Design a protein around this nucleic acid. Structure first.
Lengths: 50, 122, 101, 77
RNA sequence: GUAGUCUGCCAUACGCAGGAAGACCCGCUGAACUGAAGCAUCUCAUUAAGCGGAGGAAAAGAAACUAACUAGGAUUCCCUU
RNA sequence: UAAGUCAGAUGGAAUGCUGCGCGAUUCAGAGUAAAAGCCUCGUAUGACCAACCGCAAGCUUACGAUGGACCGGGGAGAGUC
RNA sequence: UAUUACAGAUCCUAAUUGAAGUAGCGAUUAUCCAGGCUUGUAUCCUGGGGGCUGAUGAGGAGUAGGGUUUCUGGACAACUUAAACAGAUCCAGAGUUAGUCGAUCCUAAUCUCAAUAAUGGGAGAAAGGGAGUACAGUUGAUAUUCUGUAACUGACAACAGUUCGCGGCAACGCAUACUAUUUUUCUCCGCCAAUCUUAUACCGUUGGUAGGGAUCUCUUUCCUACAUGACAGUACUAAUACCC
RNA sequence: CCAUGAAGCGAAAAAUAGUUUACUGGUCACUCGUACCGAUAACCGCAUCAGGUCUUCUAGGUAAGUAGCCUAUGGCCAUUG
RNA sequence: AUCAUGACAGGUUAAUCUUUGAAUGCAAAUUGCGCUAAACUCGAUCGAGAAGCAUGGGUGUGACAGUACUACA
């Protein structure tokens, strides 16, 4: 960046909208506990390698 | 409100197309207002009208296909859409008449040498 | 020259599909768009990602019956297209926005 | 010499995303190491029988193929 | 010049080939560790990996076959030899 | 598709404990607030009524097919063994 | 009937001691005082001292790479060798606007298909080639992209008015088409050294007027400010090259 | 200089044929990138690592100076008491 | 939504079937660069979308090339 391609930009979009906390209502629905979002990361710690 | 797939079959093609566009318009206005107003009840109305616009598209397409198959049925080399699905293997496997057909030597002897029934006495 | 013996694909589709209603998804609700409506007479919309400015200008005209002056086209970090549509001097952008709501 | 200081100028990318694999497509050599694109046949060897069955059928959706298993249950039961 | 043929190349109408999977099956190619208390023939082995190709099974198959008898009679597999 | 949500005490809950009944072509198994032949699904076993009920190939009465004997014949896979 | 008895294998996996409140808390200019906000600040902000960096700057901006770290609001279980209301941390929202900047288009080193009835086609540079934009303003984050104002380049249309070739001895000037072939030019090119000169910066002699700083004494002083874009025009001054 | 220092697309010109009248003065401009860092904590070194990594705009004084030393604009007290 | 104009997390079959991939209009670290008789569908004669267009080989059909063979001039 800048000067990213479009299909590069498509991946970086999907990588940041997927990065969030898990919703509250799944724990209320299924009753499971201790499920983490796997595709959470931090930009500084883990690099994507894409 | 929402409407059944049975009773749409009776209606005309052009009657469905004006029904379609009017039904699809009220989808677009609700997608505008879900940003502003949001909230319950609207979010079931947007669900139903998405299901209904499929209902109209679906029965148009089977109304087309049953009519349009009758045009090309009972005729050589039909279109690819109107051919039946099948497997790759089953198409290329030749029809069992050709596999099983008899040579002019073989058929003429099969006049006499067929697989006849028989039995024994007690 | 070429001329096939039958149509290959006989079934034509039921409607346009790539429609005026499905180009323009709907308006964007932010604090930036609120200022650009009032000040510059300039709307904002979420758009289909393959839609051109020529497609948007015609599609905006067919729905709301106002021919736009300019269209300027972002693709966001959310990977959906945003279209800043300037209306002409006569119409007010608040008056078009109140109809939609 | 060969450690921390010489890690500094490591900014170029040897491999890039591959279309068929989507995973290690060599830019200079232009071949997907993992899948062999663009060779028409897809890369696997019998010495990597472990790593192959991560890629091979079953791993993905099987949209067309799962309904053709399900027919053969009904016909023989 | 025209009217047949022969040979070549191009364009087009209609169905076919490719890719997946590969335990089993068919055809090639082909090691070494190892054993021989060393090692070179030999062995591991006409095996592993590699290349090419099939089917629900494949391949084989109707005598230029055994036998030496008081004679058997396509191919395949199991027991024994 | 059989036969006790039996009675009494204990318990948050009875399928266990004590005592009396009943089923079985069904005591395989599971569910049920606790260990269940009889609380529920089943299991067992015959009875019941709908759906079909067709694809090619060959037939079908004699100089039509097939075979034996006798008369008169031809040939049997080449850069292959 | 057996995956049948453990203290050792620098055994395997999992948890845990002493050493130990010990070693140590580095490198980077330097902190101090009064206020604000708070249960709570030397640390977060304001004001005032004292300092540092000292135009190859911890200044303002970009390739490659990172990918939301940017911006506003709220939050302190953890992290940022103590503290913390702070933060590149956590949470919720928001943000990247182009005919003129780039990519796209051309080829280079180089790579890859096809034909041989052929004499090639395609790929390959976000530092090479390459038509065309400037100022001012505006947002919490965007600007040569938005708004205002002024340009410019290309392609596709008809339509109105002019015009059917002349000047200079010459160097050359002024209003003139299209297709094709060939020929030439621009694009267009190493490194080093010297002289002359616009623009920008800086230092200057001459004054000046606006505001601010300084003052026991001295200083008609000291500091800041004194500016005009792309684009389009036609005067004569005066240059060097080359030609008549 | 025993070194002689890209190509191609594109554009204009000229010559020789042939066909000729020309010149000046409304609409539209697709596609994709655009935030911020650029080492000083945002890149590579497992990390907010005294390391490493291409370039740009470049003030005054001292001095031969793009040295060292001091200071406006800009940025800062990075550093437990 | 209830003795049905038939609820939905049920099970098939048929539609719809985004960008890709053998990937196939020519390419590709690019949302780059094409082409088309009618019909189709909006668009008001003429634009656009929709849908076409790969290589190899088979049979047919047509066209071109040849001082290849031959007859009649």
């Amino acid at each position: 960046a800048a000067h990213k391609t479009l299909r590069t930009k498509r991946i970086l979009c999907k990588a940041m909208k997927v990065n969030r906390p898990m919703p509250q209502f799944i724990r209320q629905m299924t009753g499971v506990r201790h499920i983490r979002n796997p595709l959470t990361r931090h930009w500084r710690r883990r690099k994507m390698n894409i | 409100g929402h409407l059944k797939g049975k009773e749409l079959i009776k209606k005309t093609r052009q009657e469905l197309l004006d029904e379609l566009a009017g039904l699809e318009k009220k989808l677009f206005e609700l997608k505008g207002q879900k940003a502003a107003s949001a909230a319950a009840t609207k979010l079931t109305e947007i669900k139903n009208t998405r299901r209904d616009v499929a209902r109209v598209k679906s029965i148009l397409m089977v109304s087309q296909r049953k009519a349009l198959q009758e045009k090309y049925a009972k005729a050589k080399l039909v279109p690819i859409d109107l051919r039946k699905h099948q497997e790759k293997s089953l198409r290329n496997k030749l029809a069992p008449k050709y596999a099983n057909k008899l040579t002019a030597q073989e058929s003429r002897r099969h006049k006499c040498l067929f697989e006849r029934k028989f039995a024994l006495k007690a | 020259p070429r001329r096939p013996a039958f149509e290959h694909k006989a079934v034509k589709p039921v409607s346009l599909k790539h429609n005026d209603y499905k180009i323009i998804r709907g308006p964007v609700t932010s604090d930036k768009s609120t200022v650009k409506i009032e000040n510059e007479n300039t709307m904002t919309f979420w758009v289909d990602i393959k839609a051109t400015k020529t497609e948007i200008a015609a599609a905006f005209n067919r729905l709301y019956k106002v021919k736009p002056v300019k269209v300027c086209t972002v693709i966001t970090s959310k990977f959906v297209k945003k279209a800043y549509i300037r209306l002409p001097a006569n119409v007010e952008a608040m008056n078009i926005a109140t109809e939609i709501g | 010499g060969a450690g921390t200081p010489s890690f500094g100028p490591r900014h170029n990318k040897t491999h890039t995303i591959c279309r068929r694999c989507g995973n290690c497509f060599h830019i200079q050599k232009s071949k997907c190491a993992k899948c062999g694109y663009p060779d028409a046949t897809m890369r696997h060897y019998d010495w990597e029988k472990k790593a192959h069955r991560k890629r091979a059928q079953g791993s993905g959706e099987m949209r067309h193929l799962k309904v053709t298993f399900a027919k053969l249950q009904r016909a023989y039961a």
